[PDB]
Design a protein around this ligand. Structure first.
Ligand SMILES: [Mg+2]
Ligand SMILES: [Mg+2]
Ligand SMILES: [Mg+2]
Ligand SMILES: [Mg+2]
Ligand SMILES: [Mg+2]
Ligand SMILES: [Mg+2]
Ligand SMILES: [Mg+2]
Ligand SMILES: [Mg+2]
Ligand SMILES: [Mg+2]
Ligand SMILES: [Mg+2]
Ligand SMILES: [Mg+2]
Ligand SMILES: [Mg+2]
Ligand SMILES: [Mg+2]
Ligand SMILES: [Mg+2]
Ligand SMILES: [Mg+2]
Ligand SMILES: [Mg+2]
Ligand SMILES: [Mg+2]
Ligand SMILES: [Mg+2]
Ligand SMILES: [Mg+2]
Ligand SMILES: [Mg+2]
Ligand SMILES: [Mg+2]
Lengths: 184, 167, 260, 141
RNA sequence: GAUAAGGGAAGUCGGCAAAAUAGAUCCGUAACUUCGGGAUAAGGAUUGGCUCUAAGGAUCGG
RNA sequence: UAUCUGGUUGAUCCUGCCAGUAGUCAUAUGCUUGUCUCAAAGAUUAAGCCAUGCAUGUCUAAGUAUAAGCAAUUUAUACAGUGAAACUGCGAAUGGCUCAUUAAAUCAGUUAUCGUUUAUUUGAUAGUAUACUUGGAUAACCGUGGUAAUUCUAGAGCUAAUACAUGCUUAAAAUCCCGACUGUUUGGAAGGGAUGUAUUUAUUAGAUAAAAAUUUGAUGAUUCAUAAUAACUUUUCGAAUCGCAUGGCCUUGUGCUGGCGAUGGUUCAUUCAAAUUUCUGCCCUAUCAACUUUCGAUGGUAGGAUAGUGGCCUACCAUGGUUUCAACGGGUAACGGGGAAUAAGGGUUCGAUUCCGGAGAGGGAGCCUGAGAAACGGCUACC
RNA sequence: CCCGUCGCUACUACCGAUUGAAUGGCUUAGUGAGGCCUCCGGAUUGGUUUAGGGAACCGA
């Protein structure tokens, strides 16, 4: 069994430690989910204490939040474009935490147009919109992407732990950072 | 003597790890799994006996198989099962239609009938009423204990209001 | 080892139970309950070794299965129920009420009280915090959780519980001059007033306590139980001896004069 | 030395800087006091480094034992080794012998330590195979 | 000049003849020793095609 | 009892050992042996192998009874007393034995969990935006059996649940979003959705140095408790259960209400625990001086996994980490400690063994169930 | 008094061809049972259940 104990390692002085006891069940590990993109398939795992975990083996959509306006919508994920841990994860389009993905922009464009009245990519309702006006100008580098119809996002949930693939839309210098990293 | 297991497509024997819910095995303790040899699902010459079920009755009577019949040993026991099998609508009283098998102990005979399950009775309705009355009374006890604490807090806060003004 | 232990060796039982070595191999292992194992008193020990009502464990079980014994106003049928400090035991068949208070000699005294005092008990607040739906609550030393406490209550105070509604009758704030009984260490059972609290953050606060005989001792804050608002005014009756520790020479002289 | 020197973006968790805000374009910084009367260095209030294991801006907590020792190596990235000297009593000879133990502690960029300083380190949760302590105070040597 | 089931020197004075090994990269390498060797000791792993990535330079412009 | 005596020489004084002397909770053995109390006992060599028998099962008024079981006619033609066998629930992870492995390992004293899970016990905690009560299986049983053989089980006919899967019954407002119309200086609005609790994200309260030109908890300390917003979910559970009593209301009913109990259920706390964990402390050996780092060794970033921290594992990147204050290696006729023998004091020797901790059930390894096992009087595979 | 070859008897350890032998630990390389996760698979077995012979699509 996969074991997380530190006994099998050699000590800080470099001495090999002798075998103390048989592997115990309270230090087990399991195998990575390696979440892909495909029709949703989640398997439950019975964990210590009788609790439940959900392995997302394949998912298509997730709930992603646009932080500045504070609104979240569920949208499909197109693919993985960047992963700080392993490039084989980008190549196989494996969903893990902190993975950079492209998400569908329609729910956010629709919310934006209904809430502010402007477009992207580049009586009472009208009064509410006129009041909300002025705050409707967003950053150019984020606005330009809606023209391509795909937003950059990072997964925040842990799909191998909860079966969900949720995240937030990149903005500010974090967005500038991953654009520079991606383009190189 | 090894029995046949459905889905194993062989005329021979294979060894499987059988568990609870599998045929050809009865687990002795909870969670126990045994590796047992079982015969495939393909008919061959190595069978000592084959079990057959008559789907369509033939021409000639079978001596002890198609002429007689054995009544079912037990009647229905659940209330909705009594309603479904034969005899009544939801407004009928199931209590006096249950089949009772009478036993003969020498000279005096008495009847035995099953205990009906899922039968609505005044005790059942009393328990339902008790549960909902307790739930409502509890909800009121909680929301007035909360209201009383809100009075206590308002009094303390008012006292702290005058305390700051004084100091 | 692979799960919780269910036996208790006689030699490994708490010493303040005063069990004899040779009556057998095992001792009553207290059940899970309001009080910790080392600081509790099982009802079999209370009813058989102290009160001597039962001659053996079969008889104590016969006694308890007739619904006579009540702890904190509720009938208990668990023979190894972990009764503990300040708990009230009622035996209405004999019409007797006991309180489990430590005596100054370190053991649980059998301190009988009248029914009027047996109608309540005190509990030291271990923590106060907010529960679900934003309801604050206090957890006492016997594991009780009482919601909607007086907003002035903080940790280490002592509350007086109505014990029939589970509500708070009144409380004592932790401060200088309060009467205290010590519930741990070698000074177990002594009663005095707090003279000075010396705090040690990230560590253990220490409390300096002055006895009624002007004896001063120091103990950890976790072993301090406030039982009265000032000297000579305890909220519960003290056991015989009034929690005053005498040296062995004074005890020997007192015993000689009392018996001759 | 730059903060975004890794293949991943370095930032404090759950600290959100809203781009649609006022002209006060200063990156929001989170910090905490470790308690026990230890002062937060101003390099944490005014700095820009990101360290999840740092006592003041990270999620570790200081609890347990407080030890002092001499820094003997700064050749690891963000990790030091301190040396603790003590006297062991040998009852048979009614005398003592010098002994020492090496304890590995994490040092945040809010402190600058070189070999020879005497530091005070507080215990934290296990943050590595050999590192379980985290520097709280530095005295120049 | 080739191949050959199973065995593998039982053939023969004798392993005669044939077979097996073989290039390169990486790992590893004993007794003994005249300290130079033994040594390619012994004993192991890899090797194609295709699509990429990185490193290694020159001349001009202060 | 803080003690000494014989032995080298022809004789002497010394160094020095041999011998004598006493104890042993220290074993064996020889001889002898009347009484009372107390009482060790396959540790040493073989953690070698085992014939045979036993050591873990369990039912109350309160889960399931048509035994074709017993008993009596009784408040009873639904059952009602007693009661095998089975299904369901729980226990079997405790105990008992042994000390093989194990030398910073175990363990001892001392810490921490603001780094986690926790059956059970004990406290609290749920009005939430077909209903007089939902489904279809299955056991025991009967009768056809196959094998020499097992705690093997297969066809066929029934039939149950606190087993399995679904599903209503209900307060009063209030708040939020969209919003046709309308007022038309930005208000009013018909109509639609959403509110409990769990899960997963993202974003906000969660304050507290003393005068001039409204609330806000704890800690030494937190991104804590808790609350709110936007969404999300192969939708967790907000009782389709069981026993005794039968009370109260009369606008002529199997009407509406209700008393003491069993069990279960979400979350928080507690307890019994568990898992990691700080500091310091282990016998001999240098005829062991360098060890660790291919292929994790030390650290960083990101991830995966875990109940959770952590190179526990993966990817990328640095070259670190231990050591004459003895690392590393080797030996141990080594389970550790509380303790035991002997002892003026200081010490020397022993500690498998009545208590505590750890480990094992021929040797490894891998798992199911379960709160809890890498369990062996559980399973799977190899030797 | 006494020393050493040489000669006799007994015992102990050492060296010693045998690429001697046995047991245990660690380990390179090759093969690799079995469990677990995953991937399809779809024996048979219930109907989201629809249908005038029954042709679809849902679950296990
Ligand atoms: Mg051939
Ligand atoms: Mg061949
Ligand atoms: Mg050959
Ligand atoms: Mg020959
Ligand atoms: Mg020949
Ligand atoms: Mg010859
Ligand atoms: Mg020749
Ligand atoms: Mg030749
Ligand atoms: Mg050679
Ligand atoms: Mg070679
Ligand atoms: Mg290749
Ligand atoms: Mg002697
Ligand atoms: Mg033996
Ligand atoms: Mg045990
Ligand atoms: Mg015994
Ligand atoms: Mg990590
Ligand atoms: Mg021992
Ligand atoms: Mg031994
Ligand atoms: Mg033991
Ligand atoms: Mg085992
Ligand atoms: Mg020899």
């Amino acid at each position: 069994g996969i074991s997380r104990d530190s006994r099998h390692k050699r000590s800080a002085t470099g001495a090999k430690r002798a075998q103390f006891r048989k592997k115990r069940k309270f230090e087990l590990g399991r195998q990575p989910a390696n979440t892909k993109i495909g029709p949703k398939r989640i398997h439950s795992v019975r964990t210590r204490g009788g609790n439940q975990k959900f392995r997302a083996l394949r998912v298509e959509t997730g709930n992603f939040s646009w932080g500045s306006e504070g609104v979240s919508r569920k949208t499909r994920i197109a693919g993985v474009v960047y992963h700080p841990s392993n490039n084989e994860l980008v190549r196989t389009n494996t969903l893990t935490k902190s993975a950079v993905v492209q998400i569908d922009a329609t729910p956010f464009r629709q919310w934006y147009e209904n809430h502010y009245g402007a477009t992207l990519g580049k009586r009472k309702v009208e009064r509410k919109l006129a009041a909300r006006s002025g705050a409707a100008a967003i950053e150019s580098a984020v606005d330009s992407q809606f023209g391509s119809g795909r937003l950059y996002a990072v997964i925040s949930s842990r799909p191998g732990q909860s079966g969900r693939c949720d995240g937030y839309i990149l903005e500010g210098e974090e967005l500038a950072f991953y654009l520079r990293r991606l383009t190189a | 003597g090894f029995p046949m297991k459905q889905g194993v497509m062989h005329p021979t024997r294979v060894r499987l790890l059988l568990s609870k819910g599998h045929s050809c095995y009865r687990p002795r303790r909870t969670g126990e799994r045994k590796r047992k040899s079982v015969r495939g699902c393909i008919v061959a010459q190595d069978l000592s006996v084959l079990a057959l079920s008559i789907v369509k009755q033939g021409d000639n009577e079978i001596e002890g198989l198609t002429d007689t019949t054995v009544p079912k040993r037990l009647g229905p026991k659940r209330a909705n099962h009594i309603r479904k099998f034969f005899g009544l609508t939801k407004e009928d009283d199931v209590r006096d239609f249950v089949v009772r098998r009478e036993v003969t102990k020498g000279d005096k005979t008495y009847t035995k009938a099953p205990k009906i399950q899922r039968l609505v009775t005044p005790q059942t309705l009393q328990r339902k009423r008790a549960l909902k009355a307790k739930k409502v009374k509890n909800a009121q006890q909680q929301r007035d204990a909360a209201a009383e604490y809100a009075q206590l807090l308002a009094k303390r806060l008012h006292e702290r209001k005058e305390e700051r003004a004084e100091i | 080892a692979r799960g919780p232990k269910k036996h208790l060796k006689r030699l490994a039982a708490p010493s303040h139970w005063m069990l004899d070595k040779l009556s057998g191999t095992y001792a009553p292992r207290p059940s899970a309950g309001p009080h910790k194992l080392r600081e509790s008193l099982p009802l079999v020990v209370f009813l058989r070794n102290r009160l001597k009502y039962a001659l053996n464990g079969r008889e104590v079980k016969a006694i308890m299965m007739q619904q006579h014994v009540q702890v904190d106003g509720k009938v208990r049928t668990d023979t190894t129920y972990p009764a503990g400090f300040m708990d009230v035991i009622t035996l209405e068949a004999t019409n007797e009420h006991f309180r489990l208070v430590y005596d100054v000699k370190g053991k649980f005294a059998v301190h009988r009280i009248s029914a009027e005092e047996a109608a309540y008990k005190l509990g030291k607040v271990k923590k106060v915090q907010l529960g679900k739906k934003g309801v604050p609550y206090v957890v006492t030393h016997d594991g009780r959780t009482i919601r909607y406490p007086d907003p002035l209550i903080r940790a280490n105070d002592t509350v007086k519980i109505d014990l029939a509604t589970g509500k708070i009758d009144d409380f004592i704030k932790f401060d200088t001059g309060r009467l205290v009984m010590v519930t741990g260490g070698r000074n177990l059972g002594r009663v005095g007033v707090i003279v000075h609290r010396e705090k040690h953050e990230g560590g253990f606060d220490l409390v300096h306590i002055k006895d009624a005989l002007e004896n001063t001792f120091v103990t950890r804050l976790s072993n301090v139980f406030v039982i009265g608002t000032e000297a000579g005014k305890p909220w519960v009756s003290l056991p015989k001896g009034k929690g005053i520790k005498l040296s062995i020479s004074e005890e020997r002289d007192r015993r000689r004069a009392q018996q001759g | 030395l730059t903060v975004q020197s890794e293949r991943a973006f370095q930032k404090q968790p759950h600290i959100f800087t809203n781009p649609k805000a006022k002209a006060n374009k200063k990156t929001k910084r989170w910090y905490k006091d470790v308690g026990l009367g230890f002062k937060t260095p101003k390099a944490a209030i005014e700095g820009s480094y990101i360290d999840k294991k740092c006592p003041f801006a990270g999620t570790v907590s200081i609890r347990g034992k407080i030890l002092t020792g001499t820094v003997v190596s700064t050749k690891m990235h963000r990790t030091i080794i301190i040396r603790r000297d003590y006297l062991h009593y040998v009852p048979k000879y009614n005398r003592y012998e010098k002994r020492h133990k090496n304890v590995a502690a994490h040092v945040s960029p809010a402190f600058r330590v070189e070999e020879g300083d005497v530091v005070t380190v507080g215990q934290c949760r296990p943050i590595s195979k050999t590192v379980r302590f985290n520097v709280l105070k530095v005295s120049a040597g």
